[PDB]
Amino acid sequence: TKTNGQHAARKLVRLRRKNRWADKGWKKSHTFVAQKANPFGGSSHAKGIVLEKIGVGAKQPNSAIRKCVRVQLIKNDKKIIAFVPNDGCLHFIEENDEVLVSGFGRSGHAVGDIPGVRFKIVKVSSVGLYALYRQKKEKP
Amino acid sequence: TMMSVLANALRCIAGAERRGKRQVLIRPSSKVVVKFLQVMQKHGYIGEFEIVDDHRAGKIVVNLNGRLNKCGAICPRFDCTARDFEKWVKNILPSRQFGFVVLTTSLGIMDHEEARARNTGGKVLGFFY
Amino acid sequence: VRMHGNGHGKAASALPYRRTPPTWLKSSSRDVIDAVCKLAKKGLSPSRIGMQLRDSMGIAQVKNVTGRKILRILKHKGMAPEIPEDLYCLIKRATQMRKHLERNTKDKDTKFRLILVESRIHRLARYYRRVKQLPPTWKYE
RNA sequence: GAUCUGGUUGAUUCUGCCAGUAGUCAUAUGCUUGUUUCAAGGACUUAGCCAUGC
RNA sequence: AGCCAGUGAUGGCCGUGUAGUGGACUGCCAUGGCGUUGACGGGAGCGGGGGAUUAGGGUUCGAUUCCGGAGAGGGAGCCUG
RNA sequence: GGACAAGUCUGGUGCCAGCACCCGCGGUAAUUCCAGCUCCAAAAGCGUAUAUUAAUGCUGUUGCUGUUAAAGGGUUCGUAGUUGAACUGUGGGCCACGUAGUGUGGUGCCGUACCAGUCCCGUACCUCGACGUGUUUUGACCCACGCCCUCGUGGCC
RNA sequence: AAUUUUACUGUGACCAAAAAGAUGCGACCAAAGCAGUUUGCCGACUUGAAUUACAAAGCAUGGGAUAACGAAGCAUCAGCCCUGGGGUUAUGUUGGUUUUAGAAGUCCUUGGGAGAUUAUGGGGCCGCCGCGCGGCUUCGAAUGAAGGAGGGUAGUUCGGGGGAGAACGUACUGGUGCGUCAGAGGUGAAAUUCUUAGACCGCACCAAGACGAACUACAGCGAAGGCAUUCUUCAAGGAUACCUUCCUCAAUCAAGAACCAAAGUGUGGGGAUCAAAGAUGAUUAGAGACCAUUGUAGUCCACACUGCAAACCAUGACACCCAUGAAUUGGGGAGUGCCUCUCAGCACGUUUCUUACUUCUUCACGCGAAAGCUUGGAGGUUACAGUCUCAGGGGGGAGUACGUUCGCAAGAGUGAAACUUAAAGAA
RNA sequence: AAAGUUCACCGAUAUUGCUUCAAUAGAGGAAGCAAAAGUCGUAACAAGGUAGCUGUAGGUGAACCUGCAGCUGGAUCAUUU
RNA sequence: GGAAGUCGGCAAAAUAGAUGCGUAAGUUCGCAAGAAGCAUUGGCUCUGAGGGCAAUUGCCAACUCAGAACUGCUUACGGCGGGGAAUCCAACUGUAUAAUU
Numbered sequence A: 001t002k003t004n005g006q007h008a009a010r011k012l013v014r015l016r017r018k019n020r021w022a023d024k025g026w027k028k029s030h031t032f033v034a035q036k037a038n039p040f041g042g043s044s045h046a047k048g049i050v051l052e053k054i055g056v057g058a059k060q061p062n063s064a065i066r067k068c069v070r071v072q073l074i075k076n077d078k079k080i081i082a083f084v085p086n087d088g089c090l091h092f093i094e095e096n097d098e099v100l101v102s103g104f105g106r107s108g109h110a111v112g113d114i115p116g117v118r119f120k121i122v123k124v125s126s127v128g129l130y131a132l133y134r135q136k137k138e139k140p
Numbered sequence B: 001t002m003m004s005v006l007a008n009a010l011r012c013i014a015g016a017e018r019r020g021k022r023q024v025l026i027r028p029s030s031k032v033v034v035k036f037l038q039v040m041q042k043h044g045y046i047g048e049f050e051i052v053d054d055h056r057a058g059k060i061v062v063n064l065n066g067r068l069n070k071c072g073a074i075c076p077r078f079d080c081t082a083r084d085f086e087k088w089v090k091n092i093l094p095s096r097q098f099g100f101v102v103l104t105t106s107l108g109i110m111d112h113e114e115a116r117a118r119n120t121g122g123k124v125l126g127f128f129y
Numbered sequence C: 001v002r003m004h005g006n007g008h009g010k011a012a013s014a015l016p017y018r019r020t021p022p023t024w025l026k027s028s029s030r031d032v033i034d035a036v037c038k039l040a041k042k043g044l045s046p047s048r049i050g051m052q053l054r055d056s057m058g059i060a061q062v063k064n065v066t067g068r069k070i071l072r073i074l075k076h077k078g079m080a081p082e083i084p085e086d087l088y089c090l091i092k093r094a095t096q097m098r099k100h101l102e103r104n105t106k107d108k109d110t111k112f113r114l115i116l117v118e119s120r121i122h123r124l125a126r127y128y129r130r131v132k133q134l135p136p137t138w139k140y141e
Numbered sequence D: 001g002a003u004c005u006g007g008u009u010g011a012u013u014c015u016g017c018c019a020g021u022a023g024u025c026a027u028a029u030g031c032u033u034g035u036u037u038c039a040a041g042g043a044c045u046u047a048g049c050c051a052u053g054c
Numbered sequence E: 001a002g003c004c005a006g007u008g009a010u011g012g013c014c015g016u017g018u019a020g021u022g023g024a025c026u027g028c029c030a031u032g033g034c035g036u037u038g039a040c041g042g043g044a045g046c047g048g049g050g051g052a053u054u055a056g057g058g059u060u061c062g063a064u065u066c067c068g069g070a071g072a073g074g075g076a077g078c079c080u081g
Numbered sequence F: 001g002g003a004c005a006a007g008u009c010u011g012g013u014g015c016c017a018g019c020a021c022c023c024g025c026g027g028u029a030a031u032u033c034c035a036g037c038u039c040c041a042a043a044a045g046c047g048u049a050u051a052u053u054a055a056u057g058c059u060g061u062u063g064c065u066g067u068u069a070a071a072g073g074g075u076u077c078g079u080a081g082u083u084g085a086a087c088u089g090u091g092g093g094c095c096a097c098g099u100a101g102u103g104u105g106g107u108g109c110c111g112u113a114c115c116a117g118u119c120c121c122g123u124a125c126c127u128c129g130a131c132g133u134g135u136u137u138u139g140a141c142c143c144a145c146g147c148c149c150u151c152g153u154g155g156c157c
Numbered sequence G: 001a002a003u004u005u006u007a008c009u010g011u012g013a014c015c016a017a018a019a020a021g022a023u024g025c026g027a028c029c030a031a032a033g034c035a036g037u038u039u040g041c042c043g044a045c046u047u048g049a050a051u052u053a054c055a056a057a058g059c060a061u062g063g064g065a066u067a068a069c070g071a072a073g074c075a076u077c078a079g080c081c082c083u084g085g086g087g088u089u090a091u092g093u094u095g096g097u098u099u100u101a102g103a104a105g106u107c108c109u110u111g112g113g114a115g116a117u118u119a120u121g122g123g124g125c126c127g128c129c130g131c132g133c134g135g136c137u138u139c140g141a142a143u144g145a146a147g148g149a150g151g152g153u154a155g156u157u158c159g160g161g162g163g164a165g166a167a168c169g170u171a172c173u174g175g176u177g178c179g180u181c182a183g184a185g186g187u188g189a190a191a192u193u194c195u196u197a198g199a200c201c202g203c204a205c206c207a208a209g210a211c212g213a214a215c216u217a218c219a220g221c222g223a224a225g226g227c228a229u230u231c232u233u234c235a236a237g238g239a240u241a242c243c244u245u246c247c248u249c250a251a252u253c254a255a256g257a258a259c260c261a262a263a264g265u266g267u268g269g270g271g272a273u274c275a276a277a278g279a280u281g282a283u284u285a286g287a288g289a290c291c292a293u294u295g296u297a298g299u300c301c302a303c304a305c306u307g308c309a310a311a312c313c314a315u316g317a318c319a320c321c322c323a324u325g326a327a328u329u330g331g332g333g334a335g336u337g338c339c340u341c342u343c344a345g346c347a348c349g350u351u352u353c354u355u356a357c358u359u360c361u362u363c364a365c366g367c368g369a370a371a372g373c374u375u376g377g378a379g380g381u382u383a384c385a386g387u388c389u390c391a392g393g394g395g396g397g398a399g400u401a402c403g404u405u406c407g408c409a410a411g412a413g414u415g416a417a418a419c420u421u422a423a424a425g426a427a
Numbered sequence H: 001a002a003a004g005u006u007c008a009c010c011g012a013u014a015u016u017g018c019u020u021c022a023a024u025a026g027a028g029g030a031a032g033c034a035a036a037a038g039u040c041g042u043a044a045c046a047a048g049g050u051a052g053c054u055g056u057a058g059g060u061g062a063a064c065c066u067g068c069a070g071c072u073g074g075a076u077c078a079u080u081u
Numbered sequence I: 001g002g003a004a005g006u007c008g009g010c011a012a013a014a015u016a017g018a019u020g021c022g023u024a025a026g027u028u029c030g031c032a033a034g035a036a037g038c039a040u041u042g043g044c045u046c047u048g049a050g051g052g053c054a055a056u057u058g059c060c061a062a063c064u065c066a067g068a069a070c071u072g073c074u075u076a077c078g079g080c081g082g083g084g085a086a087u088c089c090a091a092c093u094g095u096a097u098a099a100u101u
């Protein structure tokens, strides 16, 4: 079969080092290109400023409008598209406000039938969007 | 080419037992092969065998009795300490109630039950059950 | 398998189990050594000497009577060849191929076969140098 | 504890990846919090800038 | 995929400086030293004792209380001991 | 709804609003959306995001795959590297009886068979004197075992 | 004088604590911490054990598996013992002229005991072509030869294997000379084409270039790509036979090297056929295509390049085991037909054997998701270990971009990512 | 015995020039991927109506067509005994 | 002050020897190249290296290169390339309207 040496550890070490670059999971954690292209510099959340409110359509089998916003980040001035969850909840956003943005799950992959959206709105004016939805708090 | 005459002989024997034969012929044989056979014969696993002499490496005729299930060499001959006997048993044996792992120590070739009694260790050679 | 090809041949000689002379031979050990020395004086190779005794004198396996191999006998008497006979015969063949190729430049098949022969010479000469049968810094060409 | 499940077909047996699942003196944010014991606490980014007292 | 030598690179000889040996340094002499068993260059990163996950083999984290090293906005010189 | 424990309950909306980590639900009777009532998990705790370990035999030394699913170089030569045939030899006696299988000889040799005989068919049998079992008992083998061995031959004694 | 080393294994040496495993003790339990317990006094029992450690290092035990040295055997030759001869120390002390005699060295010779290889053979004359006798002088101790490798000898063996010459064969095209007279060619049907200036057809010749039909096959040879008339030549290659020689010389491979169908490139030749580009005629809604008539590069040779194929058995090389029955190619061993010299020859029939291409429908076991594979296995594998090496990692972006090496160019080798998708795929 | 003079040595800092790394604007020219199915056709899947495919060279609105050599993964495991 | 002059940097200015180091794009691999750029240079007093011929010694010839201490400048004969980034044309060396090309 393969090499069975008792003095062939060098060949087996070189083989594993070369072949470990072939899986996308291991390569993503040792290459530094993902962090640069990621709007969050490897961070759980980020803070930004709302530019305008947009409505994106859903993918083919479904049919809806997904009520996103366009957000310009603060730490590096990159522009992203984020989705505001739950019923209503667009009237709590307004323009030029400051929001906290988190990932959508799946670590950069788009989610659901929303085309190319991978961020969700968490806090607006530093109160909490779900707390506003449940009326546990009032907008400042 | 032929790199291990111990791996060869143990492959011939386990092959003939799979088919159901009563005798095998083994070439080219050596001292290590004969000492391995005596360990299997002493535990009552093969039966009588005889060495035919040419003025070269000889040949061996072995009589079977339907008791052997498998026998094979371990390559390369790893190293085993007297505390490492169990780990090998858990890996290459069907159960710890029966079976044998044959080692080569400085006392001589002998199975792991005898080696533990003398409290020694060495390089593994093979197994049979 | 052959070392430089695709042939699987098995033709060879099988030597007898009984090494004693066959008791009808006469031709004592002293006479055999005399015959070997006489033949080598005529330029015959060690392999050709064994053939001549076998086919005409009844001596099979010269080692079995006089106890000495043919090359050892010739070395003791100081008539051994300068280079080993297998190396000499390979070199002679490579020379004849090269002489042929100087007039036939399009013989690409003989060019392939010449690469195989010279690879054999360089592998053999490396061995004879390690076991000191050839002077160190001996080169084929 | 030496364990796995949903998605390719009109059905079937595969390769294979997506998704599920349990931890983390591992960080942050959301909701909610009676008692007690033990406890880490401006490394992450900016070895950036510093009133006053010791 | 080659690296090192004017202006120290590897070694030798008397010397000088140091607390002391030393190419640490002056003069002279020789032509050496390292590298596919990965030199030279580049990227991430304070070492370790140790933490997390655990059939077994492993994978990963370790700025942080103990030990060692280094620095006092940036970088160089020096007195007293 | 399923993975995954827990409603074929009752109102509202009508591919809209929304849910949905994945498969999917919503176009007038929605087991999936917004609510009420019950129920389930675990509980002073419980969700979400990102990174990482196990799941993963999807990095395989233990331990993967390569005819057709991803994957054998167009074919030979060849250096560093990795891997490489057999051989020098694992004593001998007595102890002592326990034990121990072979075969070895002999021992009795019943009972039957068989062998050679008698009557005597036929063209079957009946009578009469070794050969083979299977009772015991020798020779080596091995296992339990103390000593000796100039522990091959010599050569001393 | 003498005077073996390493790895592996047993047991000791040598190793801050905290953390980790744990030995003891109800801190009311526990996470903890090393402390604590007396049916009471001026106290007693006291504890706080013992472990481990990637590799390297250090004393000593064995010698089985291993690896480091050495040798290449004529490169080696060397008895042992015992006489008997020849040739610093003391001299109370110190310094010198001194010396005992020894010990070494050489050369002689006397007792003995060994030898792992007979001292035999040669020189050697005489008298009886051979023939023994007498005196005689002169000068063989090493394992064995792998159903591992290499080399040798033989059948002047075997074959579309390779390179050079000289010829041969019909055919396509074009000419020449005769004959004949109205069409010929092509298609599903036609039209571009040729033709009374004699086409097509018939016979005989000539020139030039290419190609070797039928025989020709589940046949042969070659590393692959490939290879088909005869005769003459040159150097090779495999199998078989062998009581020849040699004695581990081997297997497989980064780097490096040589070869490699067709198309393509450069420079000289050659130019019959077919035929990319191009031109006409058709068909069609259109037809740039398929069909017809043509036609340049190419197709052929020499010398330099290129280095890609469904370059396929889509199956890397070496070694072992493994059930049957009919065939076939080459070598070897042990009744029938032809038979005046490549002839003590050549075919065939029966039985064995080594090598090669494979077949079973009356071919295993076994394996595989299946189709299928099965003595060059895709078997002997969760009962997982003979040895080496080249690739893969969901589908696309993409064999793309950038950098670099090679190339005259065409191109070849090496080779990402951002983004995007839940399938794509196999039987 | 201070101030001071001259020289050697260590050397901050500035200017200039090279080298290297990381980010960045740009008229125009292209490529990929999505959305809606808008226009033109029908190359592949059946002998897909000229079997399909690989390498290479030329051509053309687009799928593609044509020449040369190869393959069956073919639409044939097969017919002078 | 530094091309604002002028159709136009015309004319002038400017660079400059030698030695050590260093040198880009592009390329037909020969070049481009003195690319670009940086440093040194006087006088005086010494030291070392580089040879020949006769018997280790003696005698003798040639100026080149390298190094050190001290000392000085008013930057001080002559002679001696300015450089770089691009577009158009012609491949290049050569010839050619004696007296406007």
Ligand SMILES: [K+]
Pocket (backbone or CB within 6 Å): C001, C002, C003, C004, C005, C006
């Ligand atoms: K071979």
Ligand SMILES: [K+]
Pocket (backbone or CB within 6 Å): F064, F065
């Ligand atoms: K796999």
Ligand SMILES: [K+]
Pocket (backbone or CB within 6 Å): none
């Ligand atoms: K041969």
Ligand SMILES: [K+]
Pocket (backbone or CB within 6 Å): none
């Ligand atoms: K005519």
Ligand SMILES: [K+]
Pocket (backbone or CB within 6 Å): none
């Ligand atoms: K031909």
Ligand SMILES: [K+]
Pocket (backbone or CB within 6 Å): none
């Ligand atoms: K045509």
Ligand SMILES: [K+]
Pocket (backbone or CB within 6 Å): none
């Ligand atoms: K290829």
Ligand SMILES: [K+]
Pocket (backbone or CB within 6 Å): G329, G330
């Ligand atoms: K043949």
Ligand SMILES: [K+]
Pocket (backbone or CB within 6 Å): none
């Ligand atoms: K078969």
Ligand SMILES: [K+]
Pocket (backbone or CB within 6 Å): none
């Ligand atoms: K089947």
Ligand SMILES: [K+]
Pocket (backbone or CB within 6 Å): none
């Ligand atoms: K390329």
Ligand SMILES: [K+]
Pocket (backbone or CB within 6 Å): none
């Ligand atoms: K084509």
Ligand SMILES: [K+]
Pocket (backbone or CB within 6 Å): I035
């Ligand atoms: K220039």
Ligand SMILES: [Mg+2]
Pocket (backbone or CB within 6 Å): D008, G425
């Ligand atoms: Mg599918």
Ligand SMILES: [Mg+2]
Pocket (backbone or CB within 6 Å): none
């Ligand atoms: Mg900080």
Ligand SMILES: [Mg+2]
Pocket (backbone or CB within 6 Å): none
């Ligand atoms: Mg750091």
